[PDB]
Design a protein around this ligand. Structure first.
Ligand SMILES: Nc1nc2c(ncn2[C@@H]2O[C@H](COP(=O)(O)OP(=O)(O)NP(=O)(O)O)[C@@H](O)[C@H]2O)c(=O)[nH]1
Ligand SMILES: [Mg+2]
Length: 582
């Protein structure tokens, strides 16, 4: 079935809870402190089922009084639609206004306005109240079918069930396919099961047996069982209020605001780029609300409509998410759209220069935030919740070995590389591949392609060199090696210790001046040839011992050498002796 969450907003004592108890059949406040007073104290839960559309409407009833809006803002955060309640006898009150604005700030677009207590109101006031309300709702750009009900009479509670159903059918639940994200409203411990977290599944779906992360604290846990309204279930979905069994999590360390999350599907940060209508003064500090969690943050103006947020506490948000801002004192101020969470740059300049990109092509703003890195699609989807647009990359960028590199920054460095190299090779025989990292970080993905493009440079061992091929023979260390090689076959250890560098060695072997014979014997090409000719003087008749006498070598050097002649193809080890290949 389909799951949708609605919140109920409304001014205090306007009939919120009483209505839900009659709509759902569920006492929203079931905690006694209500029933003696007659007031809801905190976030409460119920649900209506619509069999004909196969939809469970998940309902969070909110508390009225202004003293409770911290609660209120939390309930409303995750809803898709608002059940706004107005008492005609009172008309439209500031909690009526605040809750609606709040809902608007959180990006809620859908709703039913309820004129309640029709049993306590004569037809006229009913009518003027409705008019008032209509005016109000378009004034706030929040048009809602208005239903007139009496929670008590039961009057057109039906016709409310009607309008809700009509509305639900007009909704699509995009979140079902975003990465799992669940806001936690409670945590507790159940005998025989362990820690349970209860919460509003906001994006994604989660199955029994999935590993998830509780993310202020970072505990990983296999969903052992879970239940939706007292009944065990094996799958939960965005919309559903779900209880998850997560034993690994010390419930006493968990409040609201905690996330349940598909592991490695998010990023923390204390730095955001946002969008508000508000102008936010850098000095005074504002409360920021989201995911049933309050945080506090200082503001730095980047442009107008665009602000930088530094947050007291690291924080899990995605591009597009919406925030509610409160004054120091706790009155409503507005809403904010997270344009970018975890920015690299806090200096204004960079941001204002690519706003036009930041707003309509996030990929290309990302390719800018750090270009050489490139952009993994797996990453875009951790800040966005969505994989990139193949287009927004395509004409701009061309990818390599998986990662996306905007065609721009490649040519920027080829200049910086080649200009550095040639000036470096001016007084040296080369440069550390690591010395490149001092400025370049790790280009190992693409350094190859940089040098695959710049034909001139090849990398040898610990070393980067320009192709200077007649430059080996005028290298002193080379000539040293070549002279030390006149003393017969040498061992790489001695050679290495006489202090000729590996680069010169391997280069010498590459370019056919010396050869490797054992795994560690090294022989000049000159002496190789000399031995070969000396071996040839035996005819093609050619036993092991006959070579030891001809060449004067100990088996320590002979056997790897013959083994090499075999490798080259010069000789064929046909059992006892060897012969010269045609
Ligand atoms: N005559 C009449 N009175 C009603 C009706 N609905 C609610 N009331 C009265 O409304 C008063 C407060 O109702 P309630 O449902 O608590 O509203 P609330 O908005 O939940 N309270 P709070 O905002 O503080 O959480 C109660 O005393 C209730 O009996 C109705 O349909 N008819
Ligand atoms: Mg209430």
């Amino acid at each position: 079935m389909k799951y949708i969450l609605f919140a109920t907003a409304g001014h205090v004592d306007h009939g919120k809870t009483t209505l839900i108890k009659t709509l759902t059949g569920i006492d929203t406040d079931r905690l006694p402190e209500e029933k003696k007073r007659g007031l809801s104290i905190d976030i409460g839960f119920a649900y209506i089922d619509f069999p004909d559309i196969n939809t469970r409407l998940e309902i969070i009833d909110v508390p009225g009084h202004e003293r409770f809006i911290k609660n209120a803002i939390a309930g409303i955060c995750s809803a898709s639609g608002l059940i706004l309640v107005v008492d005609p006898n009172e008309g439209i009150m500031p909690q009526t206004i605040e809750h609606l604005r709040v809902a608007k700030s959180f990006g809620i677009k859908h709703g039913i306005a309820v004129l309640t207590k029709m049993d306590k109101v004569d037809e006229e006031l009913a009518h003027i109240a409705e008019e008032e309300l209509i005016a109000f709702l378009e004034k706030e750009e929040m048009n809602m079918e208005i239903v007139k009900v009496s929670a008590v009479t039961g009057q057109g509670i039906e016709d409310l069930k009607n309008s809700i159903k009509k509305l639900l059918e007009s909704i699509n639940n995009l979140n079902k396919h975003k990465p799992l994200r669940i806001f936690v409203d409670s945590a507790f411990v159940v005998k025989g099961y362990g820690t349970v977290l209860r919460g509003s599944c906001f994006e994604g779906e989660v199955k029994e047996g999935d590993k998830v992360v509780v993310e202020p604290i970072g505990v990983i846990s296999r969903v052992r069982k879970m239940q939706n309204h007292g009944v065990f279930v094996k799958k939960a979905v965005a919309g559903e209020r779900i209880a998850l069994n997560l034993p690994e999590v010390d419930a006493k360390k968990v409040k609201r605001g905690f996330l349940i999350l598909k592991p490695e599907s998010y990023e923390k940060s204390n730095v955001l780029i946002v969008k508000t209508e508000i102008d936010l003064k850098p000095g005074k500090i504002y409360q920021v609300f989201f995911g049933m969690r309050e945080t506090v943050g200082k503001i730095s103006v980047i442009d107008k409509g665009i602000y930088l947020v530094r947050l007291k506490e690291n924080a899990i948000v995605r591009r597009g998410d919406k925030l509610v801002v409160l004054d120091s004192s706790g009155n409503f101020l507005g809403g904010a759209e997270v344009l970018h969470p975890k920015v690299r740059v806090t200096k204004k300049a960079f941001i204002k220069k690519n706003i036009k990109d930041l707003l309509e092509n996030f990929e290309c703003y990302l390719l800018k935030e750090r270009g050489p890195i490139g952009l993994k699609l797996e990453f875009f989807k951790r800040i966005t919740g969505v994989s990139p647009k193949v287009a927004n990359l395509k004409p701009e960028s061309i990818e390599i070995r998986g990662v996306y590199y905007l065609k721009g920054f490649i040519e920027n460095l080829k200049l910086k590389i080649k200009k550095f190299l040639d000036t470096e090779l001016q007084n040296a025989f080369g440069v550390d591949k690591e010395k490149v990292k001092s400025m370049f970080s790790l280009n190992e993905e693409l350094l190859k392609y940089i040098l695959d493009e710049l034909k001139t440079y090849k990398i040898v061992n610990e070393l980067i060199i320009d192709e200077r091929k007649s430059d080996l023979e005028k290298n002193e260390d080379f000539q040293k090696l070549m002279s030390i090689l006149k003393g017969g076959i040498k061992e790489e250890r001695e050679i290495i210790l006489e202090g000729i560098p590996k680069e010169i060695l391997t280069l010498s072997i590459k370019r056919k001046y010396a050869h490797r014979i054992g795994e560690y014997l090294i022989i000049s090409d000159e002496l190789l040839k000399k031995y070969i000719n000396e071996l040839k003087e035996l005819g093609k008749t050619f036993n092991v011992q006959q070579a030891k006498n001809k060449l004067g070598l100990t088996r320590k050097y002979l056997i790897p050498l013959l083994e090499y002649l075999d490798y080259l193809g010069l000789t064929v080890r046909e059992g006892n002796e060897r012969r010269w290949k045609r």
